[PDB]
Design an enzyme around this catalytic site. Structure first.
Site, mmCIF file in Angstrom:
data_model
loop_
_atom_site.group_PDB
_atom_site.id
_atom_site.type_symbol
_atom_site.label_atom_id
_atom_site.label_comp_id
_atom_site.label_asym_id
_atom_site.label_seq_id
_atom_site.Cartn_x
_atom_site.Cartn_y
_atom_site.Cartn_z
ATOM 1 N N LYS A 197 0.835 -1.204 0.000
ATOM 2 C CA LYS A 197 0.000 0.000 0.000
ATOM 3 C C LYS A 197 0.875 1.261 0.000
ATOM 4 O O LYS A 197 2.093 1.187 0.196
ATOM 5 C CB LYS A 197 -0.979 -0.012 1.191
ATOM 6 N N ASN A 206 -1.232 -0.055 7.510
ATOM 7 C CA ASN A 206 -0.848 -1.452 7.724
ATOM 8 C C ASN A 206 -0.107 -2.059 6.524
ATOM 9 O O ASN A 206 -0.067 -3.310 6.354
ATOM 10 C CB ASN A 206 -2.069 -2.290 8.189
HETATM 11 N N1 LIG Z 1 -9.269 2.907 10.354
HETATM 12 C C1 LIG Z 1 -9.580 1.626 10.179
HETATM 13 N N2 LIG Z 1 -9.121 0.964 9.077
HETATM 14 C C2 LIG Z 1 -9.465 -0.330 8.944
HETATM 15 C C3 LIG Z 1 -10.298 -0.976 9.956
HETATM 16 N N3 LIG Z 1 -10.488 -2.259 9.589
HETATM 17 C C4 LIG Z 1 -9.820 -2.431 8.421
HETATM 18 N N4 LIG Z 1 -9.216 -1.281 8.052
HETATM 19 C C5 LIG Z 1 -8.418 -1.094 6.832
HETATM 20 O O1 LIG Z 1 -9.189 -1.608 5.743
HETATM 21 C C6 LIG Z 1 -8.434 -2.630 5.065
HETATM 22 C C7 LIG Z 1 -9.402 -3.643 4.514
HETATM 23 O O2 LIG Z 1 -10.045 -4.320 5.586
HETATM 24 P P1 LIG Z 1 -10.319 -5.892 5.479
HETATM 25 O O3 LIG Z 1 -10.463 -6.246 4.037
HETATM 26 O O4 LIG Z 1 -11.470 -6.166 6.387
HETATM 27 O O5 LIG Z 1 -9.020 -6.582 6.115
HETATM 28 P P2 LIG Z 1 -7.821 -7.326 5.324
HETATM 29 O O6 LIG Z 1 -8.430 -8.194 4.244
HETATM 30 O O7 LIG Z 1 -7.222 -8.186 6.426
HETATM 31 O O8 LIG Z 1 -6.881 -6.289 4.764
HETATM 32 C C8 LIG Z 1 -7.467 -3.170 6.117
HETATM 33 O O9 LIG Z 1 -6.330 -3.871 5.581
HETATM 34 C C9 LIG Z 1 -7.136 -1.900 6.879
HETATM 35 O O10 LIG Z 1 -6.110 -1.142 6.228
HETATM 36 C C10 LIG Z 1 -10.738 -0.160 11.091
HETATM 37 O O11 LIG Z 1 -11.434 -0.644 11.997
HETATM 38 N N5 LIG Z 1 -10.349 1.099 11.129
#
Ligand SMILES: Nc1nc2c(ncn2[C@@H]2O[C@H](COP(=O)(O)OP(=O)(O)O)[C@@H](O)[C@H]2O)c(=O)[nH]1
Ligand SMILES: Nc1nc2c(ncn2[C@@H]2O[C@H](COP(=O)(O)OP(=O)(O)O)[C@@H](O)[C@H]2O)c(=O)[nH]1
Ligand SMILES: Nc1nc2c(ncn2[C@@H]2O[C@H](COP(=O)(O)OP(=O)(O)O)[C@@H](O)[C@H]2O)c(=O)[nH]1
Ligand SMILES: Nc1nc2c(ncn2[C@@H]2O[C@H](COP(=O)(O)OP(=O)(O)O)[C@@H](O)[C@H]2O)c(=O)[nH]1
Ligand SMILES: Nc1nc2c(ncn2[C@@H]2O[C@H](COP(=O)(O)OP(=O)(O)O)[C@@H](O)[C@H]2O)c(=O)[nH]1
Ligand SMILES: Nc1nc2c(ncn2[C@@H]2O[C@H](COP(=O)(O)OP(=O)(O)O)[C@@H](O)[C@H]2O)c(=O)[nH]1
Ligand SMILES: [Mg+2]
Ligand SMILES: [Mg+2]
Ligand SMILES: [Mg+2]
Ligand SMILES: [Mg+2]
Ligand SMILES: [Mg+2]
Ligand SMILES: [Mg+2]
Lengths: 152, 152, 153, 153, 152, 152
Positions: free
Chosen positions: D11, D114
C-alpha cells in the site's frame, strides 16, 4: 494516543552478547520513536527499586545482583500502544515460552538471562521512565514519517 | 593499544531515517565495545564547535543548522584501531564515493545528508569525547569476549 | 540533479534465484526512488535491441537468448547520481571482479549469469527507459523522506 | 493445487516507507512464485471498487482516499495454499494484533497504515487479479526450484 | 573449471563468537556448492602442519596453540574460481586492512583472531582438502541451480 | 539441565535451497552450542531407519527415497531445553501450519519438502545422535558466553 511511552532496557547479558543494535533496530523498524537513550551501570539499589515488586520472590537477590553487574542500555520509546507493543516485540518472560520472531525467542534461553526488559503497563512505564531518565535526557521531536505510520 | 576510543554520532538524518540500530549493530559485530551512548539535540553552539574546523567553508551555516535541528545519537567506542576502523565502517565523506558495505555506501546519497560522523584522528577523538560526554557518563567494563577478539 | 533516472533490470537468473526483493531493498535502502516497475518476458528481438551495441561480440547470441529465456524485472530508479550509483550497487560486470557488499559480489559467480543490468550513462538510461516503459507506466511521486536524503530539497 | 494465485499489494505507506523489497523477499523466501508485478497509482474509483465490500464501514472514505494517494506495488504470487499463506506472511489486519515475524508485526503500528493488502479467498483473489492485471501482463514460467519446493512436482 | 575446490575453516574464535552460520550463508549466497563440512578439534600437530610454511615466523607458536585450542568448522566449497573467490569473501589477512562486506571486515579486529581461514592457491587448496578431509567426507552432488549460476 | 542435546538435520531440499547457513545462524543466535556437524548423503537404509516409526505410512517410500537422494547436514546442539527449543525454531511439521519467524514458516510450503528435521524427545534425540554420529565425532567445549546465557 500515539504519545504513549515505554521504558525498554537491554539487560547486562544483552549488552555483553552484542544485541543492542539488533534490539534498537526492531523498535525502529516497527515505527516507534526513540525519545531517550543511554548506557549506564545500574547500582544495586537502583536494581532493587526497579524490581521492588519482586522483593519477596526467591530469585530477587540474584536478579538484583546481575542487573547491576554490568552496563545496560536504557531507552524510552514513543508510539500508539507502545507499552503492549514493546512487550510483544520482547516475547514471553521465560525464553522457553517465547516464539521465534521475538527478541527472547530468537536470542535467549534462560529466564534469568533474558536479554531485555520492557515496562508491563502504562502506569509502570511512567514510573520507570521517571526513575531512569531525567527530563533533559528525553528529546521531544517529530518523526518525518509520522503521517506514514498513523492515520490520524 | 585496545584502549583507543573514538566518537561516532548518528546525525539527525540518520535518526530520522531509522538507522541507529543498524549503525550500532555494525560496530558491535566488528568487535568494538560501546562505552558511552546518549540521545540529545545539539544546540547551535554545540554544532558550531563540533564542526569548528569548517567555520570558513561555504556549507557551514547549513551544516550547523541541520546538525542542531533534531536528535543525534552520540557514542563512544573502544577497541584496537577504532578511530580508523570506525571511519572505514562509515565510508567516504561523500556517499557518491562510498562503497557498498559501508554505512554511507548502503544508506546515503548526498554529502550534506550523510547519516553519521566519526572522529578523524586519535587526538580529535579525545577532544570530541571530552566535548560530548561528562566523565561520569562513560562506562568502563570488560567484554566477556575480549580474549576471543584480541590475541594479547 | 536529484531527478536523474536509470534503468535497472533483474535478469532471468536473478528472478530464478529469488533475488528480486533483495535487489530492490538495496536501492530503497540507499535512498533512491522507485518510479517504474514491472515483470515481463523479453522477446529475443527486444534483447537484441537492448544490447545492440554488443552485436559483434562473441557472447552476444547467448546473451540475447538468455535474456529472453524467462522473466525479468524492469525498474526505473530516480535520484542524484543514480546512473553511476546504481552501477556501484550492482558491482563489477564480471562477478569475479566484484566486491562483497555489491549485488554481484554477494550473489553471482559467472559473467554470463550476473543477475542484473544497469544503464551505463545518462543518455543510455534515457534510451532504455523509453524502450521498456510507456510514458503512462511511470509514477511520479514525492518521497516523504526527500528532505532527509537531500540537503538542497 | 500449486497453481493457486493471490493478489498482494504494498500500500502507499509501504512504498513510502521503503518496504517493497522486504515484502517481496519474504514471499520469494517462502517458495512462492512471482507471476505479476507493477507499480501504479490507483485512482479513487479503483480503490472504491477494490474495497467495495467495505463501502458501509466508517473508515471506507479514508481507506479509499489513502489507497489512491500515491503509488502501490501490485503483485500476483502463485503457489500451494498461497491465498491463506500470503495472509499469514502479512499478519493480522490490525498490526497491534500481529505477531513479530510477520510483515505487519515487524513494520506497522496502525490498522489504517498497515503497509499491505492480501486477497482473502481463492474467489476474491481471482477477482482482484482480473481487476488489476490484463491477461498479457502475467508471466507464466517454471521455477528451476519447483521439485525442491514441491513433493508432487 | 567450475569443479575447482577450496578449503575454508571457521577458526576457533569464529566458532566461539557464533559466526559459523553467517560464514556458511555468505558462501551459499554467492553460488558456491558445499561438498564437505565438519566440526572438529584440531590437534597441535595438525595446526603445525596446516601452517607449516610459517614455522619460522615469530607468531607461529601462538597461532598453532590458538588454532588447536577449540573446535573449528572445516569446509570444502566447489565452484568456478572458488579459491580466489573464497579469499575475496574472507577479506585481507589483517582485519584492519579488510573492507566492510568481507568476513574479516565486518566481524574482526585483530590479525591473530581473524575468524576464518581460506586456501590461498589451487595447489594449497588441494593439499589442505586432502589433509583435513577423508574421501568419504566429500559429497559429490549436483546443484539444482547450476544452470542458473553458470552459462556453460 | 544445560547438557541436553538434540539432533537437527537440514534435509536435502534445505541443502539444495541454500538454507544451511541460515538454519545454523538461528540456532547459534538463540544460545545453543554446536557439538557435532557433518555433511553426508544418507543411504536408503539410513533413511528407512531414521524414519522407522513411519514405515506403515503411505508417504514412507517417497520420504525415504528423497531423504537419501542427496546431502543432508547433520547437527548436534546442546543447551537447556534444546530438544523442545529446536522444534520451536523449526516450526510445525506442515509448513502451512508454521508461523513466520520459524524455519518452515519462513522458507517452506509443502509437508514433504519441509527443509529440516529435529528430534521429537530427549530419548529420540539420544537415539538419533547415536545413529548419525560416532563417539569420536562429537566435540566437547565450553562456550566463552556460557555465563551470559545461563544463570546457574
Ligand atoms: N481505520 C480503520 N481501518 C481499517 C479498519 N479495519 C480495516 N481497516 C483497513 O481496511 C483494510 C481492509 O479491511 P479488510 O479487508 O477487512 O481486512 P484485510 O483483508 O485483512 O486487509 C485493512 O487492511 C485496513 O487497512 C478499522 O477498523 N479502522
Ligand atoms: N531465576 C528466575 N528469574 C526470574 C523468574 N521470573 C522472572 N525472573 C527474572 O526477573 C525479571 C522480572 O520478572 P517479571 O517482571 O515478572 O518479568 P518481565 O516483566 O517479563 O521481565 C524477568 O525479566 C527475569 O529476568 C524465575 O522464575 N526465575
Ligand atoms: N554541503 C556540503 N557538505 C559537506 C561538504 N564537505 C563536507 N560536508 C559535510 O560536513 C561534514 C564534516 O566534514 P568533514 O569533517 O570534512 O568530513 P567527515 O569527517 O568525513 O565527516 C561532512 O560529514 C559532510 O556532511 C561539501 O562540500 N558540501
Ligand atoms: N559470456 C560473456 N558475457 C559477457 C561478457 N562481457 C559481458 N557479458 C554479458 O553482457 C552484459 C552486457 O555487457 P556490458 O554492457 O558490456 O556490461 P554492463 O553494462 O556492465 O552490464 C553483461 O552484463 C554480461 O552479462 C563476456 O566477456 N563473456
Ligand atoms: N599475531 C600475528 N598473527 C599473524 C600474522 N600474520 C598472520 N597471522 C596469523 O596467521 C594466519 C596465517 O597467515 P597467512 O597464511 O599469511 O594469512 P591468511 O592466509 O590470510 O590467513 C593468519 O590468518 C593469521 O591468523 C602476524 O603478523 N601476527
Ligand atoms: N507427504 C507427506 N509427508 C509427511 C506427512 N507427514 C509427515 N511427513 C514428512 O515426514 C517427516 C517425518 O514426519 P514426523 O516425524 O511425523 O514429523 P516431524 O518430526 O515434525 O518432522 C516430516 O518432517 C515430513 O517431511 C504427510 O502427511 N505427507
Ligand atoms: Mg516486569
Ligand atoms: Mg570530520
Ligand atoms: Mg551495459
Ligand atoms: Mg480484505
Ligand atoms: Mg594462508
Ligand atoms: Mg519426527
Amino acid at each position: 494516543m500515539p504519545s504513549e511511552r515505554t521504558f525498554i532496557a537491554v539487560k547486562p547479558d544483552g549488552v555483553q552478547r552484542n544485541l543492542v543494535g539488533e534490539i534498537i533496530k526492531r523498535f525502529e523498524n516497527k515505527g516507534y520513536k526513540l525519545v531517550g537513550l543511554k548506557l549506564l551501570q545500574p547500582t544495586e539499589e537502583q536494581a532493587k527499586q526497579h524490581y521492588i515488586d519482586l522483593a519477596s520472590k526467591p530469585f530477587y537477590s540474584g536478579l538484583v545482583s546481575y542487573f547491576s553487574s554490568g552496563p545496560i542500555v536504557g531507552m524510552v520509546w514513543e508510539g500508539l500502544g507502545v507499552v503492549k507493543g514493546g512487550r510483544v516485540l520482547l516475547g514471553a518472560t521465560n525464553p522457553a515460552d517465547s516464539l521465534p520472531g521475538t527478541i527472547r525467542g530468537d536470542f535467549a534461553v534462560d529466564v534469568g538471562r533474558n536479554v531485555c526488559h520492557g515496562s508491563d503497563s502504562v502506569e509502570s512505564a511512567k514510573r520507570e521512565i521517571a526513575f531512569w531518565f531525567k527530563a533533559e535526557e528525553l528529546v521531544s521531536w517529530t518523526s518525518h514519517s509520522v503521517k506514514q505510520i498513523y492515520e490520524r
